[PDB]
């Protein structure tokens, strides 16, 4: 205004700060206010600009549980990648040290296809050095939820596992992942069927097994959990219509991840252990057995043909050519 400024950037941050520091919803008020701010400061713009940038980043960290903010951090990280390589590494480490504990405590709002998809690309955009020691990645994955009597908590718990699982099988190697699972005393009985039944009520309370045995046991239990509550859950009573389709989407990507592990050949030790575990009884009911898994999968034929075929592909990857399951899906005449 003739050498006079009408409104300054710091005043705009303060106005956004007041909105986000009140009882208004962050999805409809705080996030839409931040979006033009971080797109202006970062995408298109030495001493004062940096301080505003760090203040905005600090505000984003307080709303990091929302996937809309996660996209904003992707934009910030992408811009930071080009300008200053060193700043990209430090920012990625700061984000990784925050979201990963939140994934363990189910504090991130990733209970949807869109939110989980956004979080997947954030992990790729992050600096590889922020996730190279997979000790923290594994520690936030091999966890248990507060309770499994709530559909949202189960989906949130599984959603966080899927995001970390994808990082392990893409940005790391089988040799690295299994070795750290050996050093960190992770047990296959973390989510065993005894624990599953306890958690489904709502209560929040051996031989030297190879790490590939516990990794395959952990993934197989989630398959049983998703299969159990996809068919034993009233649609209008227990879950919702959005919670039902996300259950199948969560199962679809989990079976997809299992197929890649077995098919690629980059996870030989995991596949060998998983093939052996599919052929073993559930240690006296402590773990889901293959017969129990097939019973829950046979029921989905009339409702979810897409997921049954994914389960059929997995059964071939572990050489389960028994006609007890194949003569029924194929409807072989007798």
């Amino acid at each position: 205004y003739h050498s006079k400024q009408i409104i300054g950037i710091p005043k705009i941050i303060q106005l956004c700060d007041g909105i986000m520091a009140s009882g208004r919803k962050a999805v409809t008020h705080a996030i839409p206010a931040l979006q033009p701010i971080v797109h202006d400061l970062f995408v298109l713009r030495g001493k004062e600009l940096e301080t505003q940038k760090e203040v905005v980043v600090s505000m984003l960290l307080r709303l990091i549980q929302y996937h809309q903010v996660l996209e904003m951090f992707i934009l910030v990280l992408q811009q930071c990648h080009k300008e200053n390589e060193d700043k990209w590494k430090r920012l990625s480490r700061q984000i990784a040290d925050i979201i990963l504990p939140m994934l363990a405590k189910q504090q991130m709002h990733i209970d949807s296809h869109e939110a989980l998809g956004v979080l997947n690309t954030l992990f790729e955009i992050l600096a590889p050095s922020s996730l190279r020691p997979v000790d923290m990645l594994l520690r936030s994955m091999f966890v248990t939820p507060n309770t499994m009597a709530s559909v949202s908590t189960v989906q949130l718990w599984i959603s966080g596992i899927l995001a970390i699982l994808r990082v392990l099988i893409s940005q790391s190697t089988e040799d690295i992942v299994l070795s750290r699972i050996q050093e960190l005393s992770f047990s296959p009985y973390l989510i065993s069927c005894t624990v599953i039944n306890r958690l489904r009520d709502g209560d929040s309370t051996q031989i030297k097994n190879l790490p590939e045995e516990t990794f395959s046991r952990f993934l197989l239990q989630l398959v049983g959990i998703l299969l159990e509550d996809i068919v034993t859950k009233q649609l209008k009573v227990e879950m919702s219509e959005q919670q039902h389709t996300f259950y199948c989407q969560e199962l679809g990507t989990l079976l997809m991840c299992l197929i890649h592990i077995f098919k690629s050949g980059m996870f030989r030790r995991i596949t060998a252990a998983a093939t052996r575990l599919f052929r073993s009884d559930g240690c006296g009911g402590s773990f889901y057995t293959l017969d129990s898994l097939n019973l829950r999968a046979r029921s989905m034929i009339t409702t979810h043909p897409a997921l049954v075929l994914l389960w059929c592909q997995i059964l071939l990857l572990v050489n389960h050519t028994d006609y007890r399951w194949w003569a029924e899906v194929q409807q072989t005449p007798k």
């Binding site: 009573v237 227990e238 409702t303």
Partner: protein, 428 residues
């Protein structure tokens, strides 16, 4: 004088609109005279003079809405402030409520504070025409002024309409029921006031074994019917949401068909849009127990061996649809077609949630085997597809047209497996 007044009103009515300068101070007074005259002219013996006064009163509003609304809202509020004739009060009330959403937030708290006594006083007007206009005005006023209200100001308005639930006039009762629910809906603490209103409504009738006025029961049940759809997501709890269900079930056995009709209408509303907290209780085996005449034992709502919806379906069929004999339609002189059609709607909605309730026997414990040698099932209600009136025939078609959808969905399209156990469990 009749023809003069119509021409006199029109001449002023066109003078205001056809004036070029609308900002002159003399015009502001002139606007306050025409609006006052039209509202006074809205109360006339002749319909012609009343109709033209009404007709161009909103035409001067529409022309002046863009620029002179704050004065128009103020002028219309003065007529509401004074409790005058019903004709002049309704004319200024439905007009003001229409333009309430154009009031800027600055002049919202001052308007609401001044409007609190006006809405309370209007609730005491015995005229059915006034209560009809006030019924539609409250949701329009509260949708704009509600979020500017204090915690105890909502209570004052709520208690004003609650006292109108025992009135003899159905129009007064309906106005009170709709306004009270709408007041809670358009408030800052929407969920807190839903519990507060729900607790107050229950307290008016929670001693079911005591004596209550028929008018009071009709008013409270109507209020609960309006409140139920808004409870579908301090918050309303399972304990009080169950008490409403028990209150609804008990009043279906009332001797007055008006109370039965009101209870049945709320019962189907509880099933069309069931709150999630109540829905799990109704479909659980433990259910409530965890936390024309009925001749025999049908069970209890608090049974610990079957879902509460099983007993509800049994209660509806034994009371309004089925006798103890097979293929014996209940006579129309005992319970009318309206109750029969309403009962079948409730059964179909209940079946949509718990299809197993449709296949149960009518009576939990078989009655005397001499008078009724063969046991009758709830499925005999499908014989109403041949009823004499079209509403009961249509409700029966909807009833097990919904049963087809519910059985296939619940069974996950394994009908032989699902129907195999229901045939063994109930014998149907």
């Amino acid at each position: 004088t009749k023809k003069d007044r119509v021409n006199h009103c029109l001449t002023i009515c066109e003078n205001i609109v056809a004036q070029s300068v609308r900002n002159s101070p003399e015009f502001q007074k002139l606007l306050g005279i025409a609006m006052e005259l039209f509202l006074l002219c809205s109360d006339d013996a002749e319909s012609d003079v009343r109709m033209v006064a009404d007709e161009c009163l909103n035409k001067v509003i529409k022309a002046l809405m863009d620029s002179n609304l704050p004065r128009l809202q103020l002028e219309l509020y003065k007529e509401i402030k004074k409790n005058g004739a019903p004709r002049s009060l309704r004319a200024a009330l439905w007009r003001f409520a229409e333009l309430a959403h154009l009031v800027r937030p600055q002049k919202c708290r001052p308007y609401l504070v001044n409007l609190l006594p006006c809405l309370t006083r209007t609730s005491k007007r015995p005229e059915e025409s006034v209560q009809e206009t006030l019924a539609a005005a409250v949701p329009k006023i509260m949708a704009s002024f509600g979020n500017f209200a204090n915690d105890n100001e909502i209570k004052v308005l709520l208690k004003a309409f609650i006292a109108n639930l025992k009135s003899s006039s159905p129009t007064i009762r309906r106005t009170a029921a709709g306004s009270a629910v709408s007041i809670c809906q358009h408030s800052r603490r929407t969920q807190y006031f839903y519990s507060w209103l729900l607790n107050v409504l229950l307290g008016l009738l929670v001693p079911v074994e005591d004596e209550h006025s028929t008018l009071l029961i009709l008013g409270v049940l109507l209020t609960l019917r309006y409140l139920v759809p808004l409870l579908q997501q301090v918050s309303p709890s399972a304990e009080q949401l169950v008490q409403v269900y028990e209150l609804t079930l008990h009043h279906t056995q009332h001797q007055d068909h008006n109370v039965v009709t009101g209870a049945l209408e709320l019962l189907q509303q509880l099933f069309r849009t069931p709150p999630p907290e109540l829905l799990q209780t109704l479909t659980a085996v433990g259910g409530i127990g965890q936390l024309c005449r009925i001749k025999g034992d049908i069970g209890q709502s608090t049974d610990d061996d079957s879902a509460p919806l099983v007993h509800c379906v049994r209660l509806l069929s034994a009371s309004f649809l089925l006798t103890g004999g097979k293929n014996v339609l209940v006579p129309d002189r005992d319970v009318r077609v309206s109750v029969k059609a309403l009962a079948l709607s409730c059964v179909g909605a209940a079946v949509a949630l718990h299809p197993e309730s449709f296949f149960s026997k009518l009576y939990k414990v078989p009655l005397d085997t001499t008078e009724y040698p063969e046991e009758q099932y709830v499925s005999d209600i499908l014989n109403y597809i041949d009823h004499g009136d079209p509403q009961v025939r249509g409700a029966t078609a909807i009833l097990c047209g919904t049963l087809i959808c519910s059985i296939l969905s619940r069974s996950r399209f394994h009908v032989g497996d699902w129907m195999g156990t229901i045939r063994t469990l109930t014998g149907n």
